[PDB]
Design a protein around this motif. Sequence first.
Motif, PDB file in Angstrom:
ATOM      1  N   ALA A 121       0.841  -1.184   0.000  1.00  0.00           N
ATOM      2  CA  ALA A 121       0.000   0.000   0.000  1.00  0.00           C
ATOM      3  C   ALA A 121       0.880   1.238   0.000  1.00  0.00           C
ATOM      4  CB  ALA A 121      -0.944   0.007   1.204  1.00  0.00           C
ATOM      5  N   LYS A 122       0.288   2.363  -0.393  1.00  0.00           N
ATOM      6  CA  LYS A 122       1.013   3.622  -0.501  1.00  0.00           C
ATOM      7  C   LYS A 122       0.185   4.733   0.118  1.00  0.00           C
ATOM      8  CE  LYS A 122       1.549   5.774  -4.507  1.00  0.00           C
ATOM      9  NZ  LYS A 122       1.189   7.186  -4.228  1.00  0.00           N
ATOM     10  N   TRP A 123       0.770   5.438   1.076  1.00  0.00           N
ATOM     11  CA  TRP A 123       0.144   6.590   1.693  1.00  0.00           C
ATOM     12  C   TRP A 123       0.605   7.851   0.974  1.00  0.00           C
ATOM     13  CZ3 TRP A 123       0.465   2.029   3.880  1.00  0.00           C
ATOM     14  CH2 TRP A 123      -0.576   1.613   4.708  1.00  0.00           C
ATOM     15  N   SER A 124       0.153   9.001   1.458  1.00  0.00           N
ATOM     16  CA  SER A 124       0.500  10.264   0.823  1.00  0.00           C
ATOM     17  C   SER A 124       1.738  10.904   1.427  1.00  0.00           C
ATOM     18  CB  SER A 124      -0.676  11.236   0.902  1.00  0.00           C
ATOM     19  OG  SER A 124      -0.531  12.274  -0.047  1.00  0.00           O
ATOM     20  N   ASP A 125       2.366  10.249   2.400  1.00  0.00           N
ATOM     21  CA  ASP A 125       3.623  10.701   2.979  1.00  0.00           C
ATOM     22  C   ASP A 125       4.560   9.525   3.192  1.00  0.00           C
ATOM     23  OD1 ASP A 125       1.831   9.685   4.744  1.00  0.00           O
ATOM     24  OD2 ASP A 125       2.280  11.075   6.378  1.00  0.00           O
ATOM     25  N   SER A 126       4.390   8.472   2.402  1.00  0.00           N
ATOM     26  CA  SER A 126       5.002   7.185   2.674  1.00  0.00           C
ATOM     27  C   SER A 126       6.479   7.186   2.294  1.00  0.00           C
ATOM     28  CB  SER A 126       4.250   6.093   1.927  1.00  0.00           C
ATOM     29  OG  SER A 126       4.553   4.827   2.461  1.00  0.00           O
ATOM     30  N   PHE A 127       7.156   6.088   2.624  1.00  0.00           N
ATOM     31  CA  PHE A 127       8.554   5.885   2.272  1.00  0.00           C
ATOM     32  C   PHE A 127       8.735   4.427   1.892  1.00  0.00           C
ATOM     33  CE2 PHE A 127      13.213   6.450   2.882  1.00  0.00           C
ATOM     34  CZ  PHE A 127      13.325   7.629   2.171  1.00  0.00           C
ATOM     35  N   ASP A 128       9.577   4.175   0.893  1.00  0.00           N
ATOM     36  CA  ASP A 128       9.560   2.883   0.217  1.00  0.00           C
ATOM     37  C   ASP A 128      10.267   1.794   1.018  1.00  0.00           C
ATOM     38  OD1 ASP A 128       9.166   0.930  -1.732  1.00  0.00           O
ATOM     39  OD2 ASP A 128       9.805   2.229  -3.379  1.00  0.00           O
ATOM     40  N   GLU A 129      11.479   2.086   1.513  1.00  0.00           N
ATOM     41  CA  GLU A 129      12.552   1.180   1.954  1.00  0.00           C
ATOM     42  C   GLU A 129      13.119   0.333   0.821  1.00  0.00           C
ATOM     43  OE1 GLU A 129      12.466   3.176   4.620  1.00  0.00           O
ATOM     44  OE2 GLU A 129      14.088   1.747   5.003  1.00  0.00           O
ATOM     45  N   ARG A 130      12.670   0.536  -0.414  1.00  0.00           N
ATOM     46  CA  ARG A 130      13.121  -0.177  -1.596  1.00  0.00           C
ATOM     47  C   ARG A 130      13.714   0.783  -2.614  1.00  0.00           C
ATOM     48  NH1 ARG A 130       8.197  -2.387  -4.089  1.00  0.00           N
ATOM     49  NH2 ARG A 130       7.914  -0.121  -4.272  1.00  0.00           N
ATOM     50  N   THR A 131      12.990   1.851  -2.917  1.00  0.00           N
ATOM     51  CA  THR A 131      13.578   3.092  -3.385  1.00  0.00           C
ATOM     52  C   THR A 131      13.744   3.945  -2.122  1.00  0.00           C
ATOM     53  OG1 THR A 131      12.231   2.652  -5.329  1.00  0.00           O
ATOM     54  CG2 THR A 131      13.453   4.670  -5.372  1.00  0.00           C
ATOM     55  N   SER A 132      14.132   5.205  -2.247  1.00  0.00           N
ATOM     56  CA  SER A 132      14.238   6.081  -1.088  1.00  0.00           C
ATOM     57  C   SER A 132      13.440   7.352  -1.315  1.00  0.00           C
ATOM     58  CB  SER A 132      15.696   6.389  -0.774  1.00  0.00           C
ATOM     59  OG  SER A 132      16.370   5.220  -0.344  1.00  0.00           O
ATOM     60  N   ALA A 133      12.207   7.191  -1.783  1.00  0.00           N
ATOM     61  CA  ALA A 133      11.323   8.319  -2.028  1.00  0.00           C
ATOM     62  C   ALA A 133       9.924   7.937  -1.563  1.00  0.00           C
ATOM     63  CB  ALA A 133      11.353   8.720  -3.507  1.00  0.00           C
ATOM     64  N   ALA A 134       8.953   8.776  -1.902  1.00  0.00           N
ATOM     65  CA  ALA A 134       7.556   8.522  -1.565  1.00  0.00           C
ATOM     66  C   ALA A 134       7.034   7.417  -2.470  1.00  0.00           C
ATOM     67  CB  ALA A 134       6.734   9.796  -1.708  1.00  0.00           C
ATOM     68  N   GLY A 135       7.033   6.191  -1.963  1.00  0.00           N
ATOM     69  CA  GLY A 135       6.544   5.067  -2.730  1.00  0.00           C
ATOM     70  C   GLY A 135       5.681   4.143  -1.903  1.00  0.00           C
ATOM     71  N   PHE A 136       5.528   2.910  -2.363  1.00  0.00           N
ATOM     72  CA  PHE A 136       4.680   1.959  -1.669  1.00  0.00           C
ATOM     73  C   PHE A 136       5.390   1.411  -0.443  1.00  0.00           C
ATOM     74  CE2 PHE A 136       1.005   0.998  -4.397  1.00  0.00           C
ATOM     75  CZ  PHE A 136       1.353   1.712  -5.524  1.00  0.00           C
ATOM     76  N   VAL A 137       4.612   0.953   0.529  1.00  0.00           N
ATOM     77  CA  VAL A 137       5.146   0.155   1.623  1.00  0.00           C
ATOM     78  C   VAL A 137       4.899  -1.306   1.277  1.00  0.00           C
ATOM     79  CG1 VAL A 137       4.758  -0.572   3.993  1.00  0.00           C
ATOM     80  CG2 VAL A 137       5.109   1.802   3.472  1.00  0.00           C
ATOM     81  N   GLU A 138       5.978  -2.069   1.138  1.00  0.00           N
ATOM     82  CA  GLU A 138       5.885  -3.522   1.038  1.00  0.00           C
ATOM     83  C   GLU A 138       5.649  -4.054   2.448  1.00  0.00           C
ATOM     84  OE1 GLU A 138       9.474  -4.842  -0.760  1.00  0.00           O
ATOM     85  OE2 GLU A 138       8.898  -4.258  -2.790  1.00  0.00           O
ATOM     86  N   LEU A 139       4.393  -3.997   2.875  1.00  0.00           N
ATOM     87  CA  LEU A 139       4.053  -4.345   4.246  1.00  0.00           C
ATOM     88  C   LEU A 139       4.045  -5.857   4.429  1.00  0.00           C
ATOM     89  CD1 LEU A 139       0.622  -5.153   4.356  1.00  0.00           C
ATOM     90  CD2 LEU A 139       0.561  -2.710   3.876  1.00  0.00           C
ATOM     91  N   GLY A 140       4.705  -6.312   5.483  1.00  0.00           N
ATOM     92  CA  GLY A 140       4.715  -7.717   5.828  1.00  0.00           C
ATOM     93  C   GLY A 140       4.504  -7.875   7.317  1.00  0.00           C
ATOM     94  N   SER A 141       4.011  -9.058   7.700  1.00  0.00           N
ATOM     95  CA  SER A 141       3.521  -9.433   9.034  1.00  0.00           C
ATOM     96  C   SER A 141       2.366  -8.559   9.517  1.00  0.00           C
ATOM     97  CB  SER A 141       4.631  -9.465  10.105  1.00  0.00           C
ATOM     98  OG  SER A 141       5.401  -8.277  10.165  1.00  0.00           O
ATOM     99  N   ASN A 142       1.762  -7.773   8.628  1.00  0.00           N
ATOM    100  CA  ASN A 142       0.533  -7.045   8.895  1.00  0.00           C
ATOM    101  C   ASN A 142      -0.365  -7.082   7.667  1.00  0.00           C
ATOM    102  OD1 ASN A 142       2.310  -5.510   7.438  1.00  0.00           O
ATOM    103  ND2 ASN A 142       2.047  -3.632   8.637  1.00  0.00           N
ATOM    104  N   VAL A 143      -0.171  -8.076   6.796  1.00  0.00           N
ATOM    105  CA  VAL A 143      -1.019  -8.229   5.625  1.00  0.00           C
ATOM    106  C   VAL A 143      -2.435  -8.575   6.071  1.00  0.00           C
ATOM    107  CG1 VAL A 143      -0.338 -10.662   5.253  1.00  0.00           C
ATOM    108  CG2 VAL A 143      -1.142  -9.285   3.338  1.00  0.00           C
ATOM    109  N   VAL A 144      -3.404  -7.918   5.463  1.00  0.00           N
ATOM    110  CA  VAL A 144      -4.777  -8.000   5.933  1.00  0.00           C
ATOM    111  C   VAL A 144      -5.524  -9.028   5.098  1.00  0.00           C
ATOM    112  CG1 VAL A 144      -4.594  -5.644   6.712  1.00  0.00           C
ATOM    113  CG2 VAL A 144      -5.628  -6.082   4.546  1.00  0.00           C
ATOM    114  N   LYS A 145      -6.444  -9.733   5.748  1.00  0.00           N
ATOM    115  CA  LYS A 145      -7.064 -10.906   5.158  1.00  0.00           C
ATOM    116  C   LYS A 145      -8.572 -10.831   5.328  1.00  0.00           C
ATOM    117  CE  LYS A 145      -3.297 -14.027   6.400  1.00  0.00           C
ATOM    118  NZ  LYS A 145      -2.394 -13.455   5.368  1.00  0.00           N
ATOM    119  N   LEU A 146      -9.257 -11.784   4.708  1.00  0.00           N
ATOM    120  CA  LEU A 146     -10.707 -11.913   4.831  1.00  0.00           C
ATOM    121  C   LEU A 146     -11.026 -12.608   6.146  1.00  0.00           C
ATOM    122  CD1 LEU A 146     -12.993 -11.127   2.880  1.00  0.00           C
ATOM    123  CD2 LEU A 146     -10.729 -10.917   1.892  1.00  0.00           C
TER     124      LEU A 146
END
Lengths: 48, 48
Positions: free
Chosen positions: A1-26
Amino acid sequence: AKWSDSFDERTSAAGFVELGSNVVKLQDNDTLVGQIKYPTNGDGEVET
Amino acid sequence: KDVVIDTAQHIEATVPLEVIQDMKATYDIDGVARLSETMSQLSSQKVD
């Protein structure tokens, strides 16, 4: 997911968060609740 | 914590009579066997 003030940790700019151990489910067939802490900045390590 | 079991992919193979007859006539290879074990060893390799 990507917020409007986010940070990538993959690039170093405002990008998506590759979120893990908090992935949301049904949860029960329709509900998709989730409490996410995303890193706002990589340098000062601020998060929201 | 919740566990949900997915529906799976359908491994299928057509058996025409215009194909199973001549290919068993010339090369003597089987249609209902060489495609069944190909399916069975693709779905077995799909889990691992």
